[PDB]
Paper text:
We successfully reconstituted the ternary complex FADDFuL_H9G-Casp-8tDED_F122G/L123G-cFLIPtDED_H7G complex, henceforth referred to as the FAFuL_H9G-C8FGLG-CFH7G complex. Subsequently, we obtained the protein crystals and determined the crystal structure at 3.1 Å resolution using the MR-SAD method, in which [name] DD is not visible. Notably, the crystal structure reveals a 1:5:4 stoichiometry for the FAFuL_H9G-C8FGLG-CFH7G complex. This complex represents a single-[name] ternary [name] complex, which fits the corresponding SAXS envelope. The single-[name] complex structure unveils additional FADDDED-Casp-8tDED assembly, in which Casp-8tDED assembles a type III-II-III CSS-mediated pentamer, containing Casp-8tDED molecules C8a, C8b, C8c, C8d, and C8e. Although the only FADDDED molecule FAl uses distinct surfaces to interact with three different Casp-8tDED molecules C8a, C8d, and C8e, these interfaces are too small, which are ~330 to ~500 Å2, to form 1:1 [name]-[name] complexes for intermediate complex formation. Instead, the III-II-III CSS contributes larger interface areas, which are ~780 to ~820 Å2 corresponding to the buried surface area (the BSA) of ~1560 to ~1640 Å2, providing Casp-8tDED the ability to self-assemble transient oligomers. These oligomers then form a composite-binding site (CBS) with a larger interface area of 835 ~ 1,280 Å2 to interact effectively with [name], promoting the formation of a [name]-[name] intermediate complex. In the 1:5:4 FAFuL_H9G-C8FGLG-CFH7G complex structure, three Casp-8tDED molecules C8c, C8d, and C8a provide, respectively, a type Ia, a type IIa, and a type IIIa surfaces, while FADDDED molecule FAl provides a type IIa and a type IIIa surfaces to complete the CBS to recruit cFLIPtDED_H7G molecule CFk. In the single-[name] structure, the halt of [name] filamentation at the upper end results from the inability of the CSS of Casp-8tDED molecule C8e to bind and stabilize another [name] tDED when there’s no [name] in the adjoining space.
Numbering used by the authors:
A (entry chain L): 1 to 84
B (entry chain D), D (entry chain C), E (entry chain B): 1 to 182
C (entry chain E): 2 to 181
F (entry chain A): 2 to 182
G (entry chain K): 1 to 175
H (entry chain J): 1 to 121, 126 to 175
I (entry chain H): 2 to 28, 31 to 123, 127 to 175
J (entry chain I): 1 to 121, 128 to 176
Write the structure that this text describes.
Amino acid sequence: MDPFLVLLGSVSSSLSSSELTELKFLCLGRVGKRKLERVQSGLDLFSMLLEQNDLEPGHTELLRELLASLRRHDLLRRVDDFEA
Amino acid sequence: MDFSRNLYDIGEQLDSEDLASLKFLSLDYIPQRKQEPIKDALMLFQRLQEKRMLEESNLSFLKELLFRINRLDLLITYLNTRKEEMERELQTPGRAQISAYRVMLYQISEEVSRSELRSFKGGLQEEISKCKLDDDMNLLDIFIEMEKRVILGEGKLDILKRVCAQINKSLLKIINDYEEFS
Amino acid sequence: DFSRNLYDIGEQLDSEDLASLKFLSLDYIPQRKQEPIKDALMLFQRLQEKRMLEESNLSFLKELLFRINRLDLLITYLNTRKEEMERELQTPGRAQISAYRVMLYQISEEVSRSELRSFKGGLQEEISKCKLDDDMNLLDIFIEMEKRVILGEGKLDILKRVCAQINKSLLKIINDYEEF
Amino acid sequence: MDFSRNLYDIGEQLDSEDLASLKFLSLDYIPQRKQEPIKDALMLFQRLQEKRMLEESNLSFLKELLFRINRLDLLITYLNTRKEEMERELQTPGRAQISAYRVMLYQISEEVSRSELRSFKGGLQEEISKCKLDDDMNLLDIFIEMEKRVILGEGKLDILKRVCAQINKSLLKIINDYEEFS
Amino acid sequence: MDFSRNLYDIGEQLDSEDLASLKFLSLDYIPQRKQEPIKDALMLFQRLQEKRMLEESNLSFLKELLFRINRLDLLITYLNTRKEEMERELQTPGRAQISAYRVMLYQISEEVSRSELRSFKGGLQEEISKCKLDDDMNLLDIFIEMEKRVILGEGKLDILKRVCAQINKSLLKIINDYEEFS
Amino acid sequence: DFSRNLYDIGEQLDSEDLASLKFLSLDYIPQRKQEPIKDALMLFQRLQEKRMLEESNLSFLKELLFRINRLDLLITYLNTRKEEMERELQTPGRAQISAYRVMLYQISEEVSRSELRSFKGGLQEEISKCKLDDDMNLLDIFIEMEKRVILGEGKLDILKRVCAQINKSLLKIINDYEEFS
Amino acid sequence: MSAEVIGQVEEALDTDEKEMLLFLCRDVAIDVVPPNVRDLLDILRERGKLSVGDLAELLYRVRRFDLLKRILKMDRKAVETHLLRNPHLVSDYRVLMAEIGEDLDKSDVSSLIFLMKDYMGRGKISKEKSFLDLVVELEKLNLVAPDQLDLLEKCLKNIHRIDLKTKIQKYKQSV
Amino acid sequence: MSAEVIGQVEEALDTDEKEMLLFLCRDVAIDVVPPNVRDLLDILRERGKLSVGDLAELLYRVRRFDLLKRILKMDRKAVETHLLRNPHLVSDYRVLMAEIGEDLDKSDVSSLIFLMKDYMGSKEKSFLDLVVELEKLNLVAPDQLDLLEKCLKNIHRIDLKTKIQKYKQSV
Amino acid sequence: SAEVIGQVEEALDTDEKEMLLFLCRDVDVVPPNVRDLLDILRERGKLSVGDLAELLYRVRRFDLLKRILKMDRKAVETHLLRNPHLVSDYRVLMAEIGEDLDKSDVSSLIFLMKDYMGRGKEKSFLDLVVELEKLNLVAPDQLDLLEKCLKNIHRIDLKTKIQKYKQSV
Amino acid sequence: MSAEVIGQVEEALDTDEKEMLLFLCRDVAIDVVPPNVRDLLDILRERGKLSVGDLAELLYRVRRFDLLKRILKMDRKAVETHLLRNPHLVSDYRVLMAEIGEDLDKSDVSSLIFLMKDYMGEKSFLDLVVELEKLNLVAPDQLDLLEKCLKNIHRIDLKTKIQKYKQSVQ
C-alpha cells in the first residue's frame, strides 16, 4: 500500500498548523484527546485513523470527508487521482 | 447531521471580533486560564463540550451565544432557529444561561465608538493602571479589568454609571433598565 | 512562470483593490479565512485551494480583475482585453460570481462620502453604532446587514428603502439585478 | 478539606501575565533556577508550600501576592478578604512579606506602555546587551537584568531615576515616595 | 564561608542560559565529552574541582566566569568581589584564565537577537550541514560547529567577519578590537 | 603517547559523534560488539583488535574523523589537513569506508527532526512500529532497513522513495553516489 | 496461538499502547507484576488465559483493528460476537479507566494530580505520570475501585470535565 | 499466617516498595543484612517477628493498602488499632526518613547529596541510600538530626524541616 | 609451541573464550575452559600453528596474530584458501549470526525458540545454538527452524547468510 | 573478641567494603591470598593479628563507624588516638589507593586502564592497583606513573593527594 502511504504523506505535507488543529477537532469523536495531543502532523493522525480501520486504501470516505470539510479541493483531487 | 462538521462550519463563519465577544459572554463558565489560549471558535466549543453545555442534544447555549452577538444568519442557517423563537425562549425565567449582567455589559460595548472608547479609557485614569488602559484594549477588556479591581459588578455599578453619564445617555438607559429589572 | 505571474499581479494591487476582491470572493471564502488575508497573493492561495484558480483555469482571476475594473493587469499579465471579458460574461454560464454580489459591489461604486454618511444614518434602527462607525465602508455595512438577516437575495426591502433616500440610480441597479 | 481545590480554582482564574507578575513578586524567595520551569500558577504554589509560605493555615503571603497584582476579586471570592483589610495588614511594620523595594518596581510596570517600554530599553543600551534588550522583554525582565548587572537595587536607584525622568515624572513620584518612607 | 553551601546557592541563582554561557566559556578546560552531561551548574563546578581550578582557596576562575556572564550580583553577594575589582584583576597580563578569543565570541552572542541569529544561520548554509543549523541551535553552538569545521578560530576570523558584516556592524568592531591586541 | 592521543581524541568526542563513528564503522564492527560501545576509546580498542588502528596505521582514524567533519581533531592530534585528506581520499582504493556508508551518513546529516518524523511515517509498512520510536535516529532506521534487506548498495528504491517524499537534495545525493558507480 | 503471534503483537505496539495493555490486565494477573507486555502475554498464555479470543479482546480494547485483521484474521463482528458469547478478560471498570485516560490531555492530568495530593500526597513524582499511573497509585491506596468512584467523579467535576463524570455515572448505572 | 502469604507479598511489590521495606526493617535485621525482601520476611518469621500484625504494619508503612485488604483481609482502621495496641516493629525514625524521601525528587536528592559531601568522603542514589550512608558514618540518628535538618533547610525544603521538628517534639 | 597457549588464554575476554569453545565442539570429552581445550588439541596433534591461527582469525583478534604468531590477515586468509579448515563453515556461520545480533534481537529469538525447547540466565546466541543442538533442533543439514525464526525477527540478512551457506553445500 | 564478632562483621559488611578490606589487608598476609573476608579474619585471628585495635583500625579504614560503635564500643576519636599512639596495621599507601579508588567512577577507571594497558600485558580501581603491584608498576616509593596517568585523565585532585602522601613520607 505504498501509494496510499505516499498519498497520505503528500496530503500531510500540504497542511498547516491551523488546518491540523481543525482536523484534530474534527477527529475528536474517533480519536481521544490524549492521542490527538500526541499528533504533530497530518500523517500522524492519518496513521492513527488507519490503525482503527476508520481509513483504508479501499475505504477513503473519512479522508475525503475531512478534506471536504476543510474545503481543500486540491487535496480531494489528489485523492481522486489516487483512486484512478 | 454531523455535529462536529456543523460546529466547524459555524466556526469558519466567525472572525476574531465575534470570537472575543463569545469569550466575553462565556466568562461566567470558562476561567481566564482556559480562555487565554482560545484563538478560534472550535476550541471554545471544545471547552463547552467539556462542561456538558454543548452537545448534539443540547444546542441551547450555542443558540443563546449566537443570538446575543446578533448572528441571526448563523442561527437560521446552521441551527434552524429564527429571531422570534429565541426571544420567546429568553423571556421564560431560568432558561437564560448567560447572566443579564453580562449581556448588559456587552450591550454597552455595542453602543461605544472609537473616540468614545478613548474617552472611556481617559475616564478611568484614577482607578485603573495605565498598562491596562492601552489603546489595544477594547471595552470588554476594560470591563474585565474593572471586575478584577472590584470596580464593576452586579452590586457595584456606580463607576460604570459615572463613566457612562459622561459620553451618552442611552448607556445609562440600558444600565438602569437592567437595574430596575432586578 | 505562473507562480511568479501571480506574485507580480498581487504586487500590483493596493489595499483598496484587495478589500474589493475579498468582498467579491465572499460567496466562496468565509469570514474566518478572509480575516488573515492581508495581501492579494494570499487571497490567490485560498482560491488555489478551492480549485477555482489554477494554471489551466484562469477564469475566476480574470473575472475578479475585470469586475474590479483593473483592465491594465488583465492586458499586462493575463493577455486579456475588455471585449474578450465582455463576451465571456455575456454567456449565461461562465459567471462564477453571483449576480447578487456584483450588484451590491456596484452600489458601493456609485456612493460618495456624504452618501455613505446618509446610508449609515439610515440604518440606526436595525444596526448598532459600533458597526455604523465613521470608518466603515458600504461593503462592511452590507456584510453587517446580511449578518442581521435584513439584507439578502430574498430580502431587499431595507436596501431599497435606504437607497431611495440618497439617490435613485441605485434602485436602477437593484431592479436590473431583480429582473435576472 | 478542598484546600488544593481552592488553590486550583484560584490558579484557573490567573492568566500568564498574572503568573509572570506573581513570579516577579516572589523573586526574593524563589531563585532563578526554581523560577525558570514555573509555567503555571500551581507550580508556583508548590514552591511556596516548600518554604512553608503557603499552607492551609498560612495564607498571608498568598493574600499579599493577590493584593499586589490587584486581583482583589480573587481575594474577596476565594480568600474571603476585602481590599480594606489587606491595606491595614500591610500598614503594620513587619507583616509585609514582599519588600517595599519590590512592590515599588512592580507598580512602575503598571504605568508604562509599549512605546514607554521601548524608550526605557533605548535608555539602557550602554548598560545592557542587545540580547537582553530584545523587543520581547517586558519591564520586569529589564529590572531583573539591571539587578543582575548591579545597576538597580535598594541602595542604587540613580540609573532608574535617570531613565524614568527621561520618560515620565510620575515614575519619579513613585520612586521618591518609596524613598521618603525609607 | 561554607564552600559547598555557597556554591549551591550560586548555582541556584543560575538558569539554563547562564549555564550554557558558562559551559561555552569553559570549553578550553572541559572537553566536549565531559561537557555533554552537564545539565546544572553544580556539575560544572565539580569538573572544575577535578582540575583544581575551583576550590575553597581558588575562586579566581569562578569569579572570572561570573564576571564574564555579567552576574555581578553573585560576585558581590557570594564571592564578595566588586565590579571594578575584577576589572583590575583581569587587566594584569596572564592573570585572566579565560582566553580573549573565547570571551570575544561570547560577547558576540550578547549582541545578536533572535532574527539576527536566524540570519546568521542562513549565512552558513554552504559551510555547515542542515542538521547542525536547526532552529534549536544558539549562536554559541554555531561557533562550536564552526570551530569543529576549522572555519572559526584565533587565526581564522575571515568567515566570522564575513557573516557578521551582513547582520550588524558593531560585531565587526568587537572582532577588530580583539584582533588588534594580537 | 599514542594511547594518550587516542584518549584526548575520545575526550573531545560527543555521543552524537560517537554514534556517527559507530555507523561509519559498521562494515568492520558487527552489531553485537557495537552495542556496548558507549565511549570513543572502546571503538578505538575494537579497531586495534582488527589491526585497523595502530601506532603506524592512522589511515582509518583519519578517514573516520574526516567523514564526521571533525577537522579540528584531525589537524591538532593527527597532524593532517583537510586538503591532504581530500587528495588521499580521491585516490581510487585507499578508502576504507564504503561510498555507500558515506552517502547514508550524509543523508542523515541533511535530514532534520520533522524530516525524520516524516521519514519514520514513510516506512510504516516496512518497519515494525516499536522500531519507529521518537528516540530512533535516521542511522538506526537505516540499520533496520539493512536488517530487512530493503536498503543496500544495489537496493536504493525505497530510500529514493522516502527521500523524494521529503526532499530533493537527498535524491541529488543518492544520484551523485550512483554516478560514482 | 503461538509465540510468533505474541511477537508480532508486541512489535507493533508503541510505549503508550504497551502501558495501557499492562494496565488492563492488572486484574487477571494480580498474582504477578509483569515487567513488560511480552512477559504479560506469555504469563497469560501459560495460565490458559490468552486464547485467540483473549488476544482479540485485548486488541479490541486498544482499537488496533489493523492488528486484528492482519495477525488474528478477525473483523469487528468476530471480536464483538466473541465478547458477547464469552466472559470478558478485562472488566468494564478497566475499560472505563482507560477511556477516561484517553480523554485527558497533559494539563488535565496535571490538574487532576494537583487535586489528589490532598487525599494521597504527591506520591510517585519522579517523572510526569500518565492518568493510568495515578489510577494505579489510587488503587494501591484503596481510593478507587469498581464500587468506589465518588472521589474520581468529584475530582473530574472539579477540573471542569463534566463529560467524564457522565461517563462514570453511565458505568454506575450499567451495574 | 503461612508461606503463601509471604510469596504473594513478595510477588506483588514493585522495586521501590521492596527497597523501602528493606530500609524500614534495618533496625530488626541488624546482625544479618537480608539480600532481598523474601529472605527478610523469612528471617522475620524464623525469629518470630513476622506475625499477621507485623506483616500488616509492614504493608501499612509501604502504603500497600490493597494488599492489606486482599491478602490479610484488613482495613486501615484495623492496622491503626494494631499499631495503637502493640509496640511497633518499625520505629518512627524509619517512617520519618521514608516520608521525607517520598517527598523528594531527583533534583532535591542530588542537591542534598552535594551539601553532604563536606561531612562525608557515585551513581544516582535515592534518599534512603543517602540515609544508609550517613548512618554508616554516624552522621544521622534518631537523636542526631541536626545535620539533616540543616541540609534540608539549606535546599529550601522547610516542610521537611518541620517534619523533623515534629518528630523531635513528639519524643 | 606450548608457551604460546598460555599467553593466548591470558589475553582473551569471556565472550571470545566462549566463542572459541563453541567452534571446537566438533572435535569427545567436553573441555571445561579454553586452556584445557587447547592443551588437549595440541596433545592429539590436531592443533598445529595454522589451526591456532585459524582460531584467532575466527574470533577476529588480528592483534594477537601480530604479537604472538607474527602473522597478518592475508597470510591466514591464503592458508584457509589453500588447505582444509579445522572449524567447519557451519560453526563460522553460527558465530557470524551471533555477532550480528544485538541483545534485543537475541532476546526475541530466544522467545521464539522457547516453543520448541525448554527454559535454559542471560545466555548468548551461541548458548542457544548449543541448547538447540542438544535437543536435535538445529544442525548443518537442519537450518529451516533457525532460518524461520530469523525471518520472524526481521533479520533477512542472516536468513540470506543461511541460504548462502546452504547453497555452498 | 570471639568468632561471633567475626561472623557479625562478615555478615554486616557490604560487597565493596569487603573488597576494600581485602585490598587493605593484602600487605599483611602474603603467604596466603585470602579469597573472602571471613577467611581473612580467621587467618588474622589465628596468626594473632586480630586484636581489638586491629579490627577497630580495619572498620575505621572502611569508613564503617556504626560497626565500631555497635561491636567494639568505640568512636572515631578513640580509633584516631589509637592510630596516633600505636603502630598501624594498614600502611598509608593502601589508604591512599583506596581513597583514589573511592574518588573514581567507572568511566574514569576505564580511561585509566586504557592508558595503563600499554605498560602492562570491567575491573575496579583496586584490581588495577593489585595488577600494577604484581607487575612492579606502583609502590609506596614508585608513584610517578600513577600520578602522571591521573594527571592525564584531568584528575589533578588525585595528583595532589599523591603529592600529599609523598610529603607525608619525607
